[PDB]
Amino acid sequence: GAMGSMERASLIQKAKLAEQAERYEDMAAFMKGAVEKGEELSCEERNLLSVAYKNVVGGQRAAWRVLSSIEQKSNESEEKGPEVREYREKVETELQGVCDTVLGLLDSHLIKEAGDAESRVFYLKMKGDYYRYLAEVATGDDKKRIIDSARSAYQEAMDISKKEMPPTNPIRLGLALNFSVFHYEIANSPEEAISLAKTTFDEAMADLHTLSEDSYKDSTLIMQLLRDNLTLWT
């Protein structure tokens, strides 16, 4: 790895600088280097890893959607040659490469060393998310296995979170939010998506009285996202 000669603490410092500079490809490379030092990640470090790759893959997903839409229209039309498909394929392969990189970091060896609920649920949720991004661009016979991998990671995260975290825990809430999106957008299960979002929202509502002002703000922010999706879906 190109970051093998840099100190772990320097990689973390530079990831934070890269975030401030909106240099998310750099930020992800720095955090990959930090993971590859072999030590577990703190809560703050896990969030830096997630922010970095979320921004990188988010740009790729947005670009892939633009190109896929142009490609689909081109097949409704004048033959413009292979270029739209070629370039959509190029972006798709790069996106798949980033997802494979993240999944590889989780498998070597973040998840296996994660024993606390907050770390294990965080990682997986991430594993579910990046298999979900792979599913968005997959087609038949590979899509089914990718979908099952996403489902399996989300389900293990859910099982741990329900046993080990309060229903207002922001990690638990964000996992439920994203698993519900998986059900709606990937798994063709809108009723499961709605049920999950509603039960998650209602059980968090009943636990808000236990929270400080700052925790209350953290939890209600994600509950609003659940509500926003329920509003769109029902």
Binding site: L177, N178, V181, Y184, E185, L225, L232
Partner: peptide
């Protein structure tokens, strides 16, 4: 998108 509607995720976290």
């Amino acid at each position: 998108e509607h995720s976290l």
